[PDB]
Design a protein around this ligand. Structure first.
Ligand SMILES: [Zn+2]
Length: 141
């Protein structure tokens, strides 16, 4: 269990200390979202080719959970259509609240964030980036 806890922590820390897709995209949708209680803030940019998430980057500062989740999300949604990305967001939200471990879609590293469901107050952290995604694609309708 100690090694297993360390393995969960190492996946999350790999995404936190080696974040994927840091930065700001050219010619993109910009969404800002903040979690004032924990103090997490994310700026998600998304380059859409019509309804295709052609690219997605994020900048931010926050806890390990929120920034790791943003890294994993940007990596997971790249190349998907808006509809699929929103389905993935809903699947992840349900997985965070404990409703459905729907592995119909392979969420990869995102599933390590299931650990955070152990502490309910950090669920918001884990979902910050996904909320940004939804705000992003309700902006360009
Ligand atoms: Zn946080």
């Amino acid at each position: 269990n100690a090694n297993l806890d360390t393995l969960y922590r190492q996946v999350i820390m790999d995404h936190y200390k080696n974040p994927r897709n840091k930065g700001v995209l050219n010619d993109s949708i910009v969404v800002d979202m903040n979690n004032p209680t924990c103090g997490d803030r994310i700026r998600l940019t998304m380059k859409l080719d019509g309804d295709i998430v052609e690219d997605a980057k994020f900048e931010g500062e926050g806890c390990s959970i929120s920034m790791a989740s943003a890294s994993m999300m940007t990596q997971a949604i790249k190349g998907k259509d808006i509809e699929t990305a929103l389905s993935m967001s809903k699947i992840f939200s349900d997985m965070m609240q404990g409703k459905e471990y729907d592995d119909s879609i392979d969420l990869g590293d995102i599933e390590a964030l299931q650990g955070v469901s152990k502490f309910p107050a950090r669920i918001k952290c884990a979902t910050l980036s996904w909320k940004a995604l939804e705000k992003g694609v309700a902006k360009e309708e």
